[PDB]
Amino acid sequence: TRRAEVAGGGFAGLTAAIALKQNGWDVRLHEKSSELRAFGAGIYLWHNGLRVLEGLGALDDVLQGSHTPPTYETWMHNKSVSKETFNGLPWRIMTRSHLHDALVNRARALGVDISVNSEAVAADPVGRLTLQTGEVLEADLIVGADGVGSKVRDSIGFKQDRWVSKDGLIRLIVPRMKKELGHGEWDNTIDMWNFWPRVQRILYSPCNENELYLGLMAPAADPRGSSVPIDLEVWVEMFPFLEPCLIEAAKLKTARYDKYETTKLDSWTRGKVALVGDAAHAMCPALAQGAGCAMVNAFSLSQDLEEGSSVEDALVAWETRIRPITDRCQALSGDYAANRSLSKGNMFTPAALEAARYDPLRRVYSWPQ
Ligand SMILES: Cc1cc2nc3c(=O)[nH]c(=O)nc-3n(C[C@H](O)[C@H](O)[C@H](O)COP(=O)(O)OP(=O)(O)OC[C@H]3O[C@@H](n4cnc5c(N)ncnc54)[C@H](O)[C@@H]3O)c2cc1C
Ligand SMILES: Cc1ncc(C(=O)O)cc1O
Fold it and tell me: In which element (H, E) is residue 296 found?
């Protein structure tokens, strides 16, 4: 009976744990936090990620209570510039905790051993995981899913391309306030861009009949637009049609202005150690594939470990097989971000939807564009 130690309780670690447990592995997941939770307010999942949920036996709990907008619409200075539906390509919007809970309940129903207040501080390719307390654990597989700043990764030393975004955003969950919004298509995802009179953007994303996921984006150099709690006035001014929701968002005293970083490594494996999720490939959010690829990769890792080969060879086989999809997605998303391509609309092209089109279960590309 094989034993795996997963460091990190995020979407990647939870995905890895569940997939491994389903294949007969004895698995223990380590979460440094005192409780299992997810941050970031809301999240978009596509066909590729939805398929992972199916393979994990956690799709039903996710679909129930999540939302698929009639269309993905883009605005530039309040003028609708595009409405995209991706030719039937499945996608979904939900609060992060809704997705996190589905994964945690499944992990528990499976008998995955989850340890809170357990922080991994080092990993040995020979198959050993060291915790912050000094306690050393041995296993046949060590999974580094501890996000950006991954101690598992840095304890081993990987060649890393790092970049940090100077600009960030404020992500919040507020009431739909649908009736107060009056006439409109308020069930759609609406990416509201603006460069004049100021650079302010709001990604409007309904999660269900009760919750709305908002992303208020302004330059870090904007003292008003980047402030938290939100400077109500500055947002209502350029997004008056959302005052009802903005008024509610202004009451959230814990809102935060988050920046992000991207990560590209020369490799994702070392001996019996495999890096997954942000720890291995954090990317720009343009294509909304950060978690999608993380879940695909974590799930794919379990598949390669079912070939009858050594864990070491399975890991290199895993990277070689699945990595290209993430590299291209990460590269394209970076290009979109730098050129602000999404502001033009109709940018979810076949190339952009490549990762989303991938079906990890059958290991083929579906929903052609
Ligand atoms: C602004 C923004 C918007 C985004 N929108 C989307 C989207 O719409 N759709 C999408 O798919 N992706 C999106 N992403 C990307 C997505 O958030 C990430 O790819 C994903 O959540 C991270 O996966 P993870 O589980 O590896 O990381 P984490 O999310 O942080 O995994 C690590 C977890 O392990 C714990 N941990 C950390 N260190 C240790 C340690 N040393 N020992 C034990 N535990 C530890 C932490 O508590 C943490 O929760 C977005 C990213 C940004 C920045
Ligand atoms: C879902 C999503 N899409 C695009 C961005 C971006 O910052 O360009 C952020 C998102 O959460």
Answer: helix 290-304
Contact predicate 25/334, CB 8 Å: no
Topology of domain 1-38+96-165+261-369, CATH: FAD/NAD(P)-binding domain (3.50.50)
d(CA 242, CA 13): 36
**Nearest ligand atom owner, CA of 356:** 1
- The class that CATH gives domain 39-95+166-260 is alpha beta
Give Rg (Cα) of the chain: 20
Residues ≥6 apart with Cβ < 8 Å to 305: 2, 20, 23, 25, 141, 311, 314, 318
Residue 230 CA: distances (Å) to CA of 70, 212, 218, 235, 293: 29, 16, 11, 8, 31
Which residues of the chain are in CATH 3.30.9.10 domains?
39-95+166-260
Q: Which residue has the tokens 């890393």?
A: 160
Technique used to solve these coordinates: X-ray
Q: Is 250 in the pocket of ligand 2 (CB under 6 A)?
A: no
83 CA → ligand 2 middle, Å: 16
**Interaxial angle between packed helices 47-56 and 290-304, expressed in degrees from 0 to 180 and rounded to the nearest 10:** 40
Strands 257-258 and 168-175: antiparallel
Resolution in A: 2.1
Q: Which two tokens stand for residue 299?
A: 């799930």
Phi first, then psi: what are they for 206, rounded to 5°?
-65, 135
Q: Is the CB of 36 under 6 A from ligand 2?
A: no
In the block, tokens 């990190």 appear at 8
SS3 26: strand
**CA 79 → CA 64, 165, 192, 236, 244, distances in Å?**
33, 28, 9, 17, 21
